[PDB]
Structure 1
Amino acid sequence: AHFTFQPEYGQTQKMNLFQSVTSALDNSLAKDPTAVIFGEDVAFGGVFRCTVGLRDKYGKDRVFNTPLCEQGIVGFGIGIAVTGATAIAEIQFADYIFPAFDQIVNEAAKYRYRSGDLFNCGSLTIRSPWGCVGHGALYHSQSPEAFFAHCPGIKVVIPRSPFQAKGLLLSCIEDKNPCIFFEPKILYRAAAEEVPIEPYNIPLSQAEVIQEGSDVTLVAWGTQVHVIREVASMAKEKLGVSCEVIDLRTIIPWDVDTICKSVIKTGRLLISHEAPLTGGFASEISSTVQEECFLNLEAPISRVCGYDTPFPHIFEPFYIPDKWKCYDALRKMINY
């Protein structure tokens, strides 16, 4: 396994990431009578178990299967949301979100703007499994966030843990804008952590500094946060380097201020993501940090990303931007 997962709101219980999604969804349906959940195979509990029990508890009219048609799932969800009802759509793998790209980019994202706020689909949330899983190859591994980051009017949100997933998913569901929430599927059954039973919110468009540091800033999201945490430990032990480790959380709109403040302090930035380098979201972060922090930069901003290929099957261990790749880039940057 290429990562290690590790670590005020009332009663908690141990939940893995799929359970924390179910808990979010359960709290949502309990408190919002308009809310419905739909998509492929959601009725029996979903292929990743994220909707287990929900149909029995809330009814077949609120937790239901659609035909096998992603453009339809998103269009249908928009339409629910146009009426003001909360629509929680599922796309079975993020890899299969593309048929709905037109409905997401040309419709959902532009609905409010183009109507002068006469109509909206703010009560729509699209959730989908994301990211590499060790053997998923081209169509069970993808990280599509950079495609969506170039579209004004949607929000794109990615958690790193069960506690983060529930609070961020609740925030997406309640946010008054169409949100895509990408669930790192390699984490669904990884380690549990304590998660509040009752609803709570984690703010959108806010990065989280999970470890303070003074020599270099490391930025990632999803599973890759755990990789950069381990990189921070390697750099401390092997190089005496102090790393400030930041989880971006929200891809758009992103927390420019938190990232720039960190880099003003450290003077060095390394951004990492599983998505391919070219056109990846690391380019937006690097460009922006260079614009705001030019005089503070002691070394070129590093991007350690997936290669510019489709996501391979048997070659996955060589493809991913692992801790050794991140560490080596960090080493060279420090020695610049």
Structure 2
Amino acid sequence: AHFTFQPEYGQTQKMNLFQSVTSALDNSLAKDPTAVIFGEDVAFGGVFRCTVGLRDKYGKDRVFNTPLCEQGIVGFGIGIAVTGATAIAEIQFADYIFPAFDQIVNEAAKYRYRSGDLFNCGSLTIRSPWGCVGHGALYHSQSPEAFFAHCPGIKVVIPRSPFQAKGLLLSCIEDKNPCIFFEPKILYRAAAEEVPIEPYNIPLSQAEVIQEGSDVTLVAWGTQVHVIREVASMAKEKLGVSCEVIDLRTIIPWDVDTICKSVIKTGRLLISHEAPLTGGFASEISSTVQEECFLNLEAPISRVCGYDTPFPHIFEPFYIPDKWKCYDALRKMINY
């Protein structure tokens, strides 16, 4: 495997990431009688098990299958939400969100603005499996967040763990704005961690500094947080370099203040993501940090990203911005 997963709210239970999604969804349906969950194959529990047991517990009218039509799924969800009801749509793989792109970008995102707040689809959340999985090739690997980051009026949120996933998904579901929640599918069955049984929230638009450091700031999200955590460890052991490791968590609106404050301290930034470099979200972070922290920068901001190709099958091990790529970039940046 290319990563290693490692590491107040009442009773907890060990949960993997799919279970933690199920738990968030269950808590949501229990406390919100309007809430419904729908999409392709969600009734029998979903192709990644995220809705197991929910239809039996809550009823066929609340956990149900749609026809095979992503533009429909999203338009339908918007419609539920326009009435004030909580609509939790599933898109089976993030790779298949694009049919719904017009509904997301021209409708959901603009719904409140264009109506002067007479109508909204704030109670809509779209969740979808995301990111590489070792062998998913072009259409089971994609990381689409940068496509949505250019669209004012939607929130895009990506967790790094089961604890984070449940708190962030609850916040998406309860947030008064249409949210896309991308679930890193490689983590669904990876290692478990303790997750509270009862509902709790992790705030949107807030990055989390998971390790403090003074020489360089490393920023990522999803599975890639675990890659940069390992890179921090490699840098410490091999170079005596102290790395501040930050999980961005929310892509938009993003936590500009946390990232800038870190870079003012360290004077160096490396941003990493599986998505292709060109037009990737790292370009927005780099641009912004350069604008706010120009005088503090000791070296050029580094982006270690996937290459500007479609996501390959047999070449995946050569494509991903792995720990060795991140490490080397960091080494050069420190030597600048």
TM range (shorter): over 0.9
CA offsets per residue over residues 81-140 of structure 1, 9 Å max, x none? 000000000000000000000000000000000000000000000000000000000000
Give secondary structure in 2 for the equivalent of 1:294: helix
Deviation at 1:190, TM superposition (A): 0.0
Q: Distance in 2 between matches of 1:14 and 1:210?
A: 21
Deviation at 1:144, TM superposition (A): 0.1
Give secondary structure in 1 for the equivalent of 2:139: coil
Q: Distance in 1 between matches of 2:277 and 2:258?
A: 23
Pair 1:202 & 2:202 matched: yes
Kindly report the root-mean-square deviation, in angstroms, between the aligned alpha carbons of the 2 structures. Answer: 0.1
Give secondary structure in 1 for the equivalent of 2:195: strand
CA offsets per residue over residues 29-86 of structure 1, 9 Å max, x none? 0000000000000000000000000000000000000000000000000000000000
- Structure 1: where are the runs of 5+ without partners? none
- Structure 2: where are the runs of 5+ without partners? none
Give secondary structure in 1 for the equivalent of 2:291: helix
CA offsets per residue over residues 122-179 of structure 1, 9 Å max, x none? 0000000000000000000000000000000000000000000000000000000000
Deviation at 1:201, TM superposition (A): 0.0
Q: Which runs of 4+ in 1 moved over 3 A?
A: none
Deviation at 1:280, TM superposition (A): 0.1
Q: Distance in 2 between matches of 1:229 and 1:201?
A: 24
Give secondary structure in 2 for the equivalent of 1:270: strand
Q: Distance in 1 between matches of 2:293 and 2:277?
A: 22
Identity of aligned residues (%): 100
Deviation at 1:291, TM superposition (A): 0.0
Q: Distance in 2 between matches of 1:190 and 1:112?
A: 39
Q: Distance in 2 between matches of 1:182 and 1:133?
A: 14
- For 1:52, the equivalent position in structure 2 comes to 52
- For 1:172, the equivalent position in structure 2 comes to 172
Q: Distance in 2 between matches of 1:231 and 1:7?
A: 16
Q: Distance in 2 between matches of 1:30 and 1:218?
A: 39
Give secondary structure in 1 for the equivalent of 2:126: strand
Give secondary structure in 2 for the equivalent of 1:181: strand
Give secondary structure in 1 for the equivalent of 2:295: helix
TM-score by length of 1: 1.00
CA offsets per residue over residues 207-243 of structure 1, 9 Å max, x none? 0000000000000000000000000000000000000
